[PDB]
Symmetry: C2
Subunit: 253 residues, 2 copies
């Protein structure tokens, strides 16, 4: 998932943040929140040796483009049915994020889905998204993602539905899902009319998928007192629910 | 919110878990997950001196009925626009949960709601819920809540909609919302047909309300590999969105 990620040991990892993992408006370039989540989940799974079920990450401070991000993993428990870990991200010893992650995978249970995918057009029947927010020329994460509008002429209030596809053809693994889940700030800009910053990221993974299109199905249901919240469901191209996510955001104003 | 909660200082609090805060099937009585979340949010707001925006809590171990729960608060930051804290719960020094919470309240912003409440009957037009899971006679949290069925004859797949009201007439504050958000295990039992345990609790608060009925609007969208996930929206009786929540659960099997 992250070739540039270096493991010092079980528990300690580091990665230098390059333009490919950076976002921001002109004049700003920092590590994409979703990438932070992806990295936290990656190091947790790699340290524990089992797949992520869910994770929550709180953003404490910004990680500028070019920083070395140190990730430290603490395993709180690892039994036959479940493991739990915490992952701290630091730059130069400064805390930039902390997280709690549950890991596990049990045999003997069926896969079940009660939720039904919204009836959006298939990807090749959707136009490119020409309204992504302006980005610093050195913040190039978004350049690596193909985005199409899936919401149609009458998308409901507060909703944003995008087809997303990694240009690098990576599978729709935990890392990819964590990254796509952090497209909620774009949904906020649409809901408000203003092209906020995340306070946190939460991801709940039901299953992964092979490379392809992901329906990024978002809602911003409410805001008050300078903050907003959003929820997202990540589907494959065939209506299978891969993951859900959510976050709260600090409004620009 | 919690009269029995004792503050030792900024940062350190304790509460003895009595039957009123306990749940479980016969033979088991432990601190209600939602109460854990409520307590974590309570101590964070009390230590920081501002209201909660969101919180996530990871359950590490069980807190038996009768335990003294120690809560320790660490403030990671407290500026003009936002504060962040972590809260650890321990019993006899043993970690039972850890959490990350964002706090703040900014002047000069409007309240906005894009989400529309489902068109369920009003509380007095809904029958009592006679199918709550059996509880140990010493696990009496549920006894203090009036529950009515809001879903109607054709509630959609995976959904559970309940009207909830505290018999003690407390307002629909952060504590109450955290507790009601943790009714998702009941939604899981309905979705599966089996009367799981939470791995975590997440809560995002937009606003509070005066005492009354709360529409507890839940979905279990998917499950796989021995785990499931759920999401919940908490509304007042008039269609205002108060909070949302989510969690992942370990399936009994
Ligand atoms: Ca290991
Ligand atoms: Ca204080």
């Amino acid at each position: 998932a992250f070739p540039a990620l270096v493991r010092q040991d079980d528990a300690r990892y580091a990665i230098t943040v390059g333009p490919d993992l950076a976002v921001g408006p002109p004049g700003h370039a920092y590590l994409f929140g979703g990438a932070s989540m992806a990295l936290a989940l990656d190091v947790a799974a790699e340290t524990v040796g089992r797949p992520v079920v869910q994770g929550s990450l709180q953003f404490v401070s910004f990680t500028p483009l070019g920083s070395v991000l140190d990730l430290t993993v603490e395993v709180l428990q690892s039994g036959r049915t479940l493991a739990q870990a915490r992952v701290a991200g630091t730059v130069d010893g400064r805390l930039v994020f902390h997280s709690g992650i549950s890991l596990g995978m049990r045999e003997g249970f069926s896969a079940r889905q009660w939720a039904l995918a919204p009836p959006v057009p298939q990807p090749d029947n959707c136009p490119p998204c020409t309204t992504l927010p302006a980005q610093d020329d050195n913040a190039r994460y978004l350049e690596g993602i193909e985005v199409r509008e899936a919401g149609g002429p009458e998308v409901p209030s507060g909703r944003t539905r995008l087809w997303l596809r990694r240009k690098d053809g990576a599978p729709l693994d935990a890392a990819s899902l964590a990254m796509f889940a952090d497209f909620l700030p774009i949904a906020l800009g649409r809901a408000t009319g203003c092209s906020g910053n995340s306070l946190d990221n939460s991801l709940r993974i039901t299953g992964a998928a092979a490379p392809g299109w992901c329906l990024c199905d978002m809602i911003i249901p409410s805001s008050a007192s300078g903050f907003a919240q959003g929820q997202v469901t990540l589907w494959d191209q065939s209506g299978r629910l891969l993951a859900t996510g959510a976050q709260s955001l600090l409004l620009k104003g």
